[PDB]
Structures are given as structure tokens and as C-alpha cells.
Amino acid sequence: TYKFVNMREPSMDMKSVTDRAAQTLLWTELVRGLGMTLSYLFREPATINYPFEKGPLSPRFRGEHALRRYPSGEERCIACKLCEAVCPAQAITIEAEPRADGSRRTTRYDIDMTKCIYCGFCQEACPVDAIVEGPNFEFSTETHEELLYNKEKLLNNGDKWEAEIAANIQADYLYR
């Protein structure tokens, strides 16, 4: 099924041509534009007062990363290395060697912000929900080097955006 658009067959009667002639002579479609715009003017705007108020987001929002930790403070990361095995931009580099207490956990977790895509494949790839996409986005920096994250930066953001992330992952694990 389909419908036409352009075809109109404007009737050539005396009354109809009067409206067309009037429209051309005394502009009416243009004044319609003025009426529509003026009606727009007398309407409260949609602008948001940043930073005093910022637009809505979702519990699934993908932003600056953070390496989370268990209830007692243990690193959730175990260097299973799944995250960079699926990182589409290869922004994740991981190395692991022995830890003092017999463990051999990770040492290096550098997600290059200037390489990362924020697709969120890493947090889905993680089997222990170690790396997550945090809610924060206001981390603009004036040095390219700052966005190059390291293990300590990731862990600090995990301790900074902790309560918010914990609530989000508690409000979203049923969907996932």
C-alpha cells in the first residue's frame, strides 16, 4: 500500500483562484509561519540549568570506569583477562604476577580513555563484575596524559564512585 504526496490538482474555479491569488498577493502562508513562531515564543523553554541541574540518565549509563571491590575490600579483578579479550579497541592491558599471600593477582589495569569506546563490553565480559562503567562523566582534563588511566586511578574511582555504583548494580543485575 502507498499514498501520493505532491499531486494536488488545484481547482481552477473563481473561488479557488481567489484564495491562491490572495495568498500570493497578501501573503498568508508566510504569516502562518509568523503565527507558529510567535506561539512558540509564548512557551516556557526546555533549557536545563547546568551545572545547577543536569539532564536525566539511566541505571545502565556507561561512563568513566572504576575497579570495584568485595565487601571486605578485596580486588574483584583476578586477571582472568576476558575484558581485553573482548575490548574492541584493545584499550585494556593486563599483567599478573604473584601476590605476597601466595596469590598471583593483577598488577596492571590501564584502560586508555583516549582508546576506550565505552561500549560496556568489559563489564559484561567480567565474570566477577570487577570492571564497570561508572555513572560519572565530568572528568575532562587538559592533558592527554591524564586520560591514560592506570591501576591506582581505577581503584581510586572504585572507592570514589562506590555507593552510587553499588546501588546501580543492585538495581540492574536482574536485567543482566
Binding site: 499514498k3 505532491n6 513562531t37 574492541p88 563490553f121
Partner: protein
């Protein structure tokens, strides 16, 4: 990013050379070195106007090779967001055209609306654009509770927002004389120049992928595509505007009868196991482990299957090597076919109106340059 270099026989133009390539990222070249899942956001970055529709093409393409069909529920969500992209694209298409002409207000009413569906993308996937939602096997996550009602409220009010877009452009004699009798393309030239989508629809040719070969679940939905008479940039403008009105009903039909069921195919070899299932089932861990290292192995073969993206006939031609990685995926795009006829398209017209021809062509430098 457009390097239009072109000749001025006075003020009259005889040949326009669109030196495309200014944004050329060898997307298919990088796709050769990533698995199917990793290559998915590349398509998401192809048409950064109607992004989720590009996921649609890549998904069914990999579904076709895998001989796996999406679950019925996931089929209906995809068309819901597929038409939202249609709403996304035509809103950008009409206004940027109007922005090129000199119309400013239509640009900002419609781009005020664009936030609402971008906000919907946030609730469903987690990003404003580049959702990475539609994947082989259906969709990643399920719809958040209450989202269906929210899009219903937006849709129930959106037909009102179209009227002003029509009221001050369709009737405006200024918009007419700046958009009619330009970019006129005869039917056979449109078809044989490789044009796709609206150029076919605008020029009077009765053809649409969504109806002639209804993919996904477009079978159940019913609507009417707006083929016009002349096919100039004005006629395509009505086709664009009417498509948003058409997309509104398509949104309605899927909305009121969304089927119940799973969001991903019950095939752990192709769909990642659920997080709750991941931490209890030994197979779930194994399947999830290898799926995020190498991914599903796609049987050999090759398909081109295309969808009716709002840009036009958008298809991907991937060849499988029999492993968990693609061999080569030619990024067929409506824009490249769209722009291929630009030499004729700007023929017989001057600069100030062939810029209107650029607007109606819906050219975006992520489908062509990749």
C-alpha cells in the same frame, strides 16, 4: 567533512566532483581483525544518524550465516528501535536540509525532540548514541520497566510536533521555490544509478525493502510508504516528513502488541548466558568464557542481506572463513549509491539550490567513508 570541487561556468555549474574520503577510516580493514561481537560497534559508528538500524543489518546478516533466528520478542523490540531511528534520521534529514537552506526554527524544534529518543536509548542500552543494543541473537538487555509507557507518551504527543515542521515548510512558498524543481531524477536513471530508498520512492518508483522483502517482523505491521510524482528534492522532503508520520504508526503497531518472551536466542553458543546463569552453571561459564575470547564460530558462506535503513538500501556483504572471525565485510551504504549520481544531480542548477540537493540526498560521512 566534504571536499566538493566543482566548476563555475559563470554562476552555472557543469560538473561537480565530490572528493569524498575526508573521513575515510578503513572500517572493513579493522573488521578483518576483530570477532563478530567486536566488529559490531563499527556498524554502530557507520550511520551515526540512524545508528540502531545499522545494528539491524549486521545482526540479521550474522543470523543468516549462523542459521539462527532471533526470538519473537527480540524481533519486535528491534523494529521498535528501528523505526525510532527512522524518526531519528528523518528529523535530522529534513532539518539539516532546512538548515542548509536557511531555516533555523525547524532545526531546533525537531532537535529538541531528538533528546527524548536519545534519552530512551540511555534507558535501554546506557548511551545516548552508539547503543550497541542489537546483536546477533536479538538484543543484549531487556526493556527497563515503564519504558514502553514512556515512549507511548512521547509518541502520543509527537504527531503534534510534526505539524509545525509541515506548517511552516510545506506551505511556505519560500521553501517550495528553494526545494522544488531541483535534483529532479528520472525513474530509470535513479534505478540504474544504483540509488536506493527515497530516490526510488521520490521519483515515482514503487519499491521498498520493508514491504517488498519484509525482514525481521515487518510482516505483521501495516502502513503505506509515500511514493510521490516528480522526485525532486521537494518531493523527497514530503516523503521524508510523511515517513516520520508513517514511522509513528509503525511504532504504534509494535507497541500495543509486544509479545512476551526472551530477549536473546536460547543458544549459549551464540548468545552469552545470563549473569545469574553465569555464576551457577558450568557450561555457562565455559560458553561465556570462549564467547568473549574468540566468539561463536560462523559457518562458511557469504550473504549481502540488506534492510530498509532510512537512508536507503543498507546492506553488509560479509564472507566467513569458517572461524569465529569475519574475513571481509563490504560496507554497502545507501549514501555511496546516493552520492554516486551527484554529477547529474547538481546538473542544470546553481550553487544555492544544489546545496538543497545535498540536503535531500541525506549524505552522512560515516556510511561512505566508513
Amino acid at each position: 567533512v566534504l571536499r566538493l570541487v566543482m566548476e563555475l561556468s559563470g554562476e552555472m555549474v557543469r560538473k561537480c566532483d565530490p572528493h569524498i574520503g575526508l573521513l575515510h577510516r578503513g572500517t572493513e580493514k579493522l573488521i578483518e581483525y576483530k570477532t563478530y561481537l567486536q566488529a559490531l560497534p563499527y556498524f554502530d559508528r557507520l550511520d551515526y544518524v540512524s545508528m540502531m538500524c545499522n545494528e539491524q543489518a549486521y545482526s540479521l546478516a550474522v543470523e543468516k550465516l549462523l542459521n539462527i533466528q532471533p526470538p519473537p520478542r527480540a524481533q519486535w523490540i528491534r523494529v521498535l528501535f528501528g523505526e525510532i531511528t527512522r524518526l531519528l534520521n528523518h528529523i535530522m534529514a529534513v532539518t539539516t536540509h532546512a538548515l542548509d537552506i536557511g531555516a533555523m526554527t525547524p532545526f531546533f524544534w525537531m532537535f529538541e525532540e531528538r533528546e527524548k529518543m536519545f534519552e530512551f536509548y540511555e534507558r535501554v542500552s546506557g548511551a545516548r548514541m552508539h547503543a550497541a543494543y542489537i546483536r546477533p541473537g536479538g538484543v543484549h538487555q531487556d526493556l527497563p520497566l515503564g519504558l514502553l509507557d514512556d515512549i507511548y507518551e512521547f509518541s502520543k504527543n509527537f504527531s503534534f510536533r510534526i505539524d509545525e515542521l509541515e506548517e511552516m515548510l510545506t506551505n511556505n512558498r519560500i521553501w517550495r521555490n528553494r526545494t522544488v524543481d531541483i535534483g529532479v531524477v528520472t525513474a530509470e536513471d535513479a534505478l540504474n544509478y544504483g540509488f536506493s530508498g527515497v530516490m526510488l520512492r521520490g521519483s515515482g518508483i514503487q519499491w521498498d525493502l520493508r514491504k517488498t522483502q519484509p525482514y525481521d517482523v515487518y510482516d505483521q505491521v501495516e502502513f503505506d510508504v509515500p511514493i510521490g510524482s516528480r522526485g525532486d528534492c521537494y518531493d523527497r522532503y514530503l516523503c521524508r516528513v510523511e515517513e516520520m508520520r508513517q514511522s509513528l504508526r509503525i511504532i504504534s503497531q509494535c507497541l500495543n502488541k509486544m509479545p512476551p518472551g526472551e530477549i536473546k536466542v536460547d543458544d549459549a553458543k551464540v548468545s552469552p548466558p545470563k549473569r545469574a546463569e553465569m555464576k551457577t552453571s558450568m557450561e555457562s561459564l565455559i560458553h561465556h568464557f570462549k564467547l568473549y575470547t574468540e566468539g561463536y564460530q560462523v559457518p562458511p558462506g557469504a550473504t549481502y542481506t540488506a534492510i530498509e535503513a532510512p537512508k536507503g538500501e543498507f546492506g553488509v556483504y560479509l564472507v566467513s572463513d569458517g572461524s569465529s572471525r569475519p574475513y571481509r565485510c563490504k560496507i554497502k551504504a545507501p549514501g555511496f549509491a546516493h552520492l554516486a549520481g551527484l554529477d547529474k544531480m547538481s546538473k542544470g542548477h546553481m550553487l544555492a539550490d544544489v546545496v538543497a540537493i545535498i540536503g535531500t540526498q541525506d549524505i552522512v560521512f560515516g556510511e561512505v567513508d566508513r
